[PDB]
Symmetry: D2
Subunit: 334 residues, 4 copies
C-alpha cells in the first residue's frame, strides 16, 4: 500500500529524503533524476556522508540501476522535466528538490511525464503550503501541486501554534542562528544578488534575510501580519536554533509556558515538537527527527507578557522526514 515516489535532483535534500525514506520505510523510492551525476558517483554520494555518517545498509550498482538494500532504482539524466518518463518508471508522486522549479507552472512539468502529484521541498509563491502537525488536515486530495515550506518554518510553526492557542500572541519577532548552506562560499566568492552570502563561510557570521517567519501566517491564518524576522549563518555543520520574542495577550508565567509545551509534545505533537530540560548543546540534536525541540533552560521572561523562547532543529534530517511524513498522509487520503 506504500506509494511510489520519484525524486528530482540528487542534491543534499534529495539524498537525505532518499535516506529518510529507506530508514523509515513509509514510502518507497523507485526513480531518481539528475542530469549531472552518473551512477557510480551516485553510489559514492549515497554511501558516504560527512555529517550523518555511513549509510546503514548496502548500496551498489548493477545493470544501470542503483540498488539500495536490494531495491533497484531507475536513473534518469534528463534536463527537461517534461521529458522525464515518470510514468514508465511507475512513480506516482514526484519530489521536486532542485530548487529551480518552485512555481506551479514550472513544477507542473512533471504531470505530463506520467506523475500524479508533485511535492515541492521548498517555499513556493503560488502553491499551497502544508506543515505537518499544524495545518496538514486541510489537504483535500484535489490539490495536485503542493509545497512543504522550509526547515525554519517547520521548526517555528508547531511552536507558535501552541503559544497562540494558549496565550494569544499579539506580535512577535524571530531570529535563527543557522548552520552553513551549500549556497554559501568556502572563501570570499562572487554572489550576484546577495553580496553578503558571497563572503567566506568559515570566517564570518553573515546576517541574512528570510521569509520563514512571514510564511507562518500562510499556514496559521490568525497570525497573518504578526510575525517577521531575520537570520545569522555561523560556521557550524548541521544544527540550527530558533529565537522567538513575542508579546502575549493573556498573562503567562514561565512555569505555565513550560507546562503547555510539555503537554503538547506528549499527546498531540508527539515526534514533531520535542521538549527537554537538560543542558544541551547543538551537537546533541545531530540526526534528530523532530521539527523543533523546546529548550526550557535557555529561554527567559522579562514579565508576564513579554517572553523569549528558544527552540532546536536539525535542518537536514527533520525536514527530510517531514517530506516523507507528508507524503504518507497524502496517500492515506486517496
Amino acid at each position: 500500500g506504500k506509494v511510489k515516489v520519484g525524486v528530482n535532483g540528487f542534491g543534499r535534500i534529495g539524498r537525505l529524503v532518499t535516506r529518510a525514506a529507506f530508514n523509515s520505510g513509509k514510502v518507497d523510492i523507485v526513480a531518481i533524476n539528475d542530469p549531472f551525476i552518473d551512477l557510480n558517483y551516485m553510489v559514492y554520494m549515497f554511501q558516504y556522508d560527512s555529517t550523518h555518517g555511513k549509510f546503514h545498509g548496502t548500496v551498489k550498482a548493477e545493470n544501470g540501476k542503483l540498488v539500495i538494500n536490494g531495491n533497484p532504482i531507475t536513473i534518469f539524466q534528463e534536463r527537461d522535466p517534461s521529458k522525464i518518463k515518470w510514468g514508465d518508471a511507475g512513480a506516482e508522486y514526484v519530489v521536486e528538490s532542485t530548487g529551480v522549479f518552485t512555481t506551479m507552472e514550472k513544477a507542473g512539468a512533471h504531470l505530463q511525464g506520467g506523475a500524479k502529484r508533485v511535492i515541492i521541498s521548498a517555499p513556493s509563491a503560488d502553491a499551497p503550503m502544508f506543515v505537518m502537525g499544524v495545518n496538514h488536515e486541510k489537504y483535500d486530495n484535489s490539490l495536485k501541486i503542493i509545497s512543504n515550506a522550509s526547515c525554519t518554518t517547520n521548526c517555528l510553526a508547531p511552536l507558535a501554534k501552541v503559544i497562540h492557542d494558549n496565550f494569544g500572541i499579539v506580535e512577535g519577532l524571530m531570529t535563527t542562528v543557522h548552520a552553513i548552506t551549500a549556497t554559501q562560499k568556502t572563501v570570499d566568492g562572487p554572489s550576484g544578488k546577495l553580496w553578503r552570502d558571497g563572503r567566506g563561510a568559515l570566517q564570518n557570521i553573515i546576517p541574512a534575510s528570510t521569509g520563514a517567519a512571514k510564511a507562518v501566517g500562510k499556514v496559521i491564518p490568525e497570525l497573518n501580519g504578526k510575525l517577521t524576522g531575520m537570520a545569522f549563518r555561523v560556521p557550524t555543520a548541521n544544527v540550527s536554533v530558533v529565537d522567538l520574542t513575542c508579546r502575549l495577550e493573556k498573562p503567562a508565567k514561565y512555569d505555565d509556558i513550560k507546562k503547555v509545551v510539555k503537554q503538547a509534545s506528549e499527546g498531540p505533537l508527539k515526534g514533531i515538537l520535542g521538549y527537554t530540560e537538560h543542558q544541551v548543546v547543538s551537537s546533541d540534536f545531530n540526526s534528530d527527527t523532530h521539527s523543533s525541540t523546546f529548550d526550557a533552560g535557555a529561554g527567559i521572561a522579562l514579565n508576564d507578557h513579554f517572553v523569549k523562547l528558544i527552540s532546536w532543529y536539525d535542518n537536514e534530517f527533520g525536514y527530510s522526514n517531514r517530506v516523507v511524513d507528508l507524503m504518507a498522509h497524502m496517500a492515506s487520503k486517496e
Copy 2:
C-alpha cells in the same frame, strides 16, 4: 601629564590593554604583574597574536625589564595583591584584569601597595559602573574603586541610550551571538558549575546566560527593570553581534530610527557608536575600536512600535580601548 598605569595580570584583557595603550599613547604602562609568566614568555606573548597580528613596534627584554618601543616596564611575580609594590614602580592607577578580584574589598588590596585608584575590567557586584559616552560624566574623583562593566554592556549602552532618548523604550530583550573566549573548552571538558560551557567549542553553539542587559539599568537608571537577555557562543574568533528587540512608546519608522542613530554617531558619540549602510560581515570589524556599530540593512521593523536592531562590536579591541579612554578622563578630573 599622562598618568602611570599598572596592569595586574597578563591575560587576554591585560595584553590587549597594553597594546591599546601603546597604540593610542593616551596613558603609559610602567608595571605589569603576573605570577605565572616569566619575562621571555611575556616578550613572546606580546610580540605574536593570532587574532590581531604581529605587534607594530619593537619588544625585547633587558636587565629584567620588558622594553616596548624603548620604554622599560617593571615586572612583578607576586601572588598576593597587597604585597605588590605599585608605589615603588611609580604606578598611580592599577587595572585589575585577572577576573578574580572583582569586589571592592578584594580589589582594594592594591591601595596599600601604593596605588591611588583601581579600575576593574570586569562587572562588579558593589563597585560603581561607568560606560564611556553614556554615564562617564557622573564620575566625581572621590571614588577610588570603579569598574568598566563588560564588552557586551559597552556595545548595548550607546544604542539603547539613543533609542530611549528619542522614542522611549517601554521594554526590550537582547540576544548576542558571541565569539569563543578563554573560559570555553577546545573539546568536551569538566566545567564544574556551568555544564554547557564545558562542551567542545569547535563543534557547538552553546546557549549561555549573561547579565549585561540587566547591567544597562545600573548605567541608565530610567531603564532599570526593563531589559534582559541571553547569549550564544559560536565557533568564531573575535567579533560578536548584539540583537535587540524592543517596544517603543512613540511611533518610529525605520527611516526615522536610521536618522537619529546616524546623527548621534557623528556629533556626540563619535568613535563610540558607529554607523554603516554597507553589506558588512563579522570579519569587517576585526580590530575596530568602536564600542558598537549600527547595521542599518540587517535590522527589521514589524510596525511603528516593535523593532529589531542589529549592532556589532570587536569584544577585544573596542573594550580595551574604552579602558584606556576611561582612564584618561579620570586623569583630567583630578
Copy 3:
C-alpha cells in the same frame, strides 16, 4: 570469566574506555575514581558526547552508584592513588588514564589499594610497552605494570611491521596530521614549556614534536634507531592521519606494496589494520575501531626503493578499543 576493571580518571580516555567496554562486552567496569567530578556530572558527561553522539543505552544515578545498562559502578573521589580501595570494590585490573602517574613507581601506588595489575594508557619511561597485533604475544603474566603506548604508535606499528617483514625498511621518517587535543588552547593561552601549544587551536596549524615514531623501536627491536618524525595539529575534531616516508632494501612496486598490506589486513591483522581503495576523507573514519587503515590511492612511490605510505586512525575510539583488547588477552594468560 570476564575480568573486573577499575578506571582511574574520567577524562576523555577514561570515558571512551568505559564506552568501549560497554559496547564490546569483553570486560566489565566496576569502579571509577575521579576527585573533581561528582555523580550527576558523571551521568551528564557519559550520556552526551559531541564527537561520538549520544550513548546507546541507559545511564542513571541511584544510591550513590553510577548505573549504566543496569550495572552499578562504585564511585571514588580519592586524590591519593594509594588510598583508593580498589580491592573493596572488587577491581582486579586498573586503567591509569589521568596522564600524571606514568612511571612504575607512581603507577605502582594502585597495588596496595588491592589491585593486581596496572595498565597505563600512555607512554611510559620504564614500564614495558605492548601494541596489539605486533608484540602482544611477548606478555608473560609475571609483569604487573605495563603500558599501552599511544594512539599514533598503535597506528604506525602494524603498518611498519608488515613493510619491514616483506621489504626490509632501511630507514624512515614520519609525519602525522593530528586533530586537536584537550591540552590545546581554544585561544592564545599560557603554556609554560611548550610555547607553540599555547596558541589558538581554532586558527592555527601548530607544529609539534612527538616520540611515537621512536617508540616503535621499543616494540619492534629490529627497527631501533631507524625511525623518527614530528606532527601537525590542525583544527579538526577527531580523526588523524599518519604519513610515512621510508627507504626499502628489496625492490617493491606500488602494486606489490598494496598486495601484502591487503593480505595482512585479512588474515593476521584483521580488525587492527584496515585496507581501502575508495576515495575516503577524514570523517569516513569517525568511530572506526581499527588501529590504522591503509589508503591505497593517497600514497605515492618515487622509485622501487623510496615510497610514501598514507594510513588513517580514529585516535579516540581505536585506541580505547585496544586498551580493552589488551586487557582481555591478559586475562586469558592467567
Copy 4:
C-alpha cells in the same frame, strides 16, 4: 618607466595581484576584464577582504571606471579573450588569472587584442616556467607567453636549490598541508572528476594529488625525476606549510643545514626565502610576502644523510607578489 598591466579575471588571484601592485608600486594596473562582475560589485570586492582586512586606500567608481587611489581603471566585460581591446586601454602586459586559458594557444588569444606579452598565473603544459630567485635569469625577452608556476612550487623551489647546491639531493619527497581554496565545497558537493574534493571542507582533511614537486625539475633541470609528493587540505583560511623529506649525497649535520639556509636568506635570496628560529605558528605568516620561510625548530634529522625540512608560505600574498616581481624583471629586460 613602469609597465602597463592588464588583469584578466577578478577572482582571488586577480584581486590579490591588483592589491599587491597597488601596495608595492612596481607596476601599474590600467585594465581589468571580468564578464560576470559589474563595477559596484568590483568596488565592494576590492574594498573588503575576510583574510587580509580592509584595503589601505580609497576605492570608488566614477564615469564607468574603477578608481583606486586616484587612478582610473578601464573595465571590460568581454567573454572572448580575442575580443578584449587591451591595446586601446594601453595595457602592454596581460595577467591571465582565470585558470581556463593555460596552454600557449588558448592564452595567446590576448595578443591580437593589442597586448605584447602574456603572464599565466598558473602551471602550464607547454609555456616556459619561471620562479623568481631560481631560474628567472633564463628569461631572454624573445618569449611572449610564459608562466609563473604555482604557490607550492614557489615555496619549494628556493629551498631545494639551496640544499642541492650545498649537499646534493639524491632523491626527495614532499607533503604540503594546504589551506582551503575556492574550488573546495563548503558542504559535500558534486565534483565530477575529483571525488574527494567534493566533500565538505569544514569537516575534513582531504588528501589531494599535486604536480608542484614534479614541476621543480622543469625549473631546476638537475633535479628532474628526483622529486614527487602529494598534499592535504585542512580547514584553515590562508597559510600553508611544505614538508620535504630528502636523501643527501654529502654529509650534513642539522647545524650545517641551518647555517647555509640562513646565509642564503640574507644575501642572495633576500625577500624570497626567509629564516626563523622562533616558536611560530601558521597565523604568524598571514600577509607575509616571502615565497617560503624555513622553520629551524620544526625540522628533524635521522642521520647525516636523511633529513626532514619544514618551510611556511602565504599562498595568497607571496605568490601574488612574485607575479609583480616577475613582471618588473621582464620590463627591465626590454
